């Protein structure tokens, strides 16, 4: 057996496709992020870190020797907890199709915010710089009335424009603002459409984000790293619950810095 | 012979093909929950329950022993008469092609009805909760005003979305509102055709059903369970008349809650 | 996995061949009631209900419908569970053959008395009316004599040809009678074969019933519908003892009133 201890939990074999089903279904539904930047092949449970291929000077160790450090960026795990009913897994074998799978979901939509969240905001301790943070280009300021969030936008594809980047551009908004464009409309048409006449990428629903970003999909400027994907693992059982995990480790590099604005509120 | 006694029915072969014909295309056209629902096959005349899996606490019968209750869902028989001449049967021999086929009309689209109003809002004496009442998400008010309905539908669409719910959605709407949306135009378009720009579903007429209900149909939501589909059976005959009926056994199981709006006057 | 959760039991392969063993032998014993009922097969576990064909009014949905739900009988799960040591378990794999399995024993014999209560005596609350309580043949009194049992036995013989039936009749006695008519002889014999005599089936020791049954084993009046069999499964556990269960689902239906005469203290 491996870490997930799979084998250990009290779950039957219909129950576990009914549960691996469910989680992968949240988890693409709720990704933004894996559609617009270069996703690696899994690295292994062994992958540690990530070869930036910078030098670190250190204190020379004698004299005449000159020493640099490798730079390195580490991977993160990120493990959501959630607990299933063990009445409901057992439903499953007896036929029932409405199985309460409900904390699968919320850890599902919680990974994927994180994960979403630290491509995109970063995550500080994790040493991730978000794309917001490391867009040299200018940021943007959204404005109250939907009706002229496409003016802005375009003023940011002016940037991306003035930065000299070819490539279909695509628009990712957070949940506040993609229900706004898409609720109010103009001569017969919600003001997401007037934003997908703008690009030939795609207008991209990203729940976890705060504004909004316009970015280039040509490839080579954002890298996830995973070491392992979404894998759900075994933690403990009592008669009533099981107790699993979502688990997945990765880290995020932006290797173009001009390839991306950033808008807020 | 079965319990519909066709054969003893003084119908003959080119009168029961017209109104097999007649009674399934006016069924169809009348049917909105099977476009959206998933259909099972026919059970057979047999089936008699929907085992749901779960299981109901009921006094111990000795000391020791735990006994529980399997609980299941009935299917309920909905059985429509109706009353046909007997010279316009006997009219389909010599070659007449307008025979008064009404009767059968009015009890197809009567089933249909019955159908979709189970479906939708349930029908308490068969333990059917309809998809009004098993909806978790909050119900809309629609307004008077035809132009003022895409933005509602629109606000549907966004709990959908805050639901954590992906797939084609689907707006159903009752006679009504199909008409209000149908009648009123903008911009050269009806307000019909400003709903169809919202979701990639469809806009379904469902003249059965009350308000309008606003669904994804990615498939494992709603389930409609048949023992036995629509068959046409024989009741009593006279000199003037044939009595027959549309039959139908099924139930309804909504699986998920957060899947559908509901929305009324 | 399943819900028997099996291979989460710290038993050994040996260990589970001799409690299933056990088990099995334990309850084939007491049991009497498969021996002249029809059983089914095992439905599986989705299965919940089973149909009966009959047919409940309810209140009219509209106008001109006419609605009727469904009668079916619910299958109840039936659980005993029980404690074993286990050291006793860990004697098996070092060879001993003598492992206290007493609490094995008692579950089977508890699990196979509520089974046999069930069909002859019925259990309201799983809506299951008893072979005693379905009886259309008039009851009887077994006098305080045992030498006058045959002849008691003899009258029901005589309801059974008033009831117009045919077949292999059986008599099944409860443990007194069976002791009492096992114990007392005349001429040689014990009344057991006194009875034996007097029928074509067979004398059926039924440790759970009270008083006494006579009826046809022909076929096809009484059925005991399994939706799974006889299985153990896997509570819990701790450093001492190993919790388990005896697990099986069923319903009972009677289909012939006058195939069974009941007898009393």
Chains 1, 2, 3 share one sequence.
């Not at 039957?12 to 992968?24: D, F, K, P, Q, V």
């Not at 450090?69 to 409405?98: C, H, W, Y």
């Not at 280039?216 to 619950?241: E, K, M, N, P």
Request: aromatic letters at 6%; charged letters at 25%; proline letters at 5%.
């Amino acid at each position: 057996m491996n870490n997930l201890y799979r084998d250990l939990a009290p779950v039957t074999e219909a129950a576990w496709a009914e549960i691996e089903l469910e989680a992968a279904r949240t988890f693409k539904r709720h990704i933004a992020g894996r559609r617009v930047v270069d996703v690696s092949d899994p690295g292994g449970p062994v992958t540690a870190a990530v070869s930036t291929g910078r030098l670190i000077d250190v204190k020379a160790p004698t004299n005449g020797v000159i020493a640099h450090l490798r730079a390195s960026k580490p991977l993160v795990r990120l493990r959501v907890p959630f607990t299933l009913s063990r009445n409901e897994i057992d439903d499953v074998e007896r036929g029932s199709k409405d199985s309460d799978w409900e904390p699968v979901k919320e850890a599902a939509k919680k990974l994927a915010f994180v994960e979403d969240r630290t491509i995109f905001e970063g995550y500080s301790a994790a040493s991730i710089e978000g794309i917001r943070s490391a867009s040299s280009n200018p940021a943007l300021t959204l404005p109250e009335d939907p009706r002229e969030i496409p003016d802005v936008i375009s003023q940011a594809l002016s940037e991306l424009r003035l930065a000299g980047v070819d490539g279909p551009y695509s628009v990712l908004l957070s949940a506040d603002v993609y229900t706004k464009v898409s609720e109010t409309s103009d001569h017969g048409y919600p003001i997401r459409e007037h934003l997908n006449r703008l690009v030939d990428g795609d207008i991209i629903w990203a729940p976890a984000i705060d504004g909004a970003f316009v970015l280039t999909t040509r490839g080579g400027d954002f890298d996830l790293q995973l070491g392992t994907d979404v894998a759900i693992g075994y933690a403990s059982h009592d008669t009533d619950t099981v107790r699993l995990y979502l688990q997945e480790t990765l880290t995020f590099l932006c290797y173009t810095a001009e390839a991306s604005v950033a808008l807020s509120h």
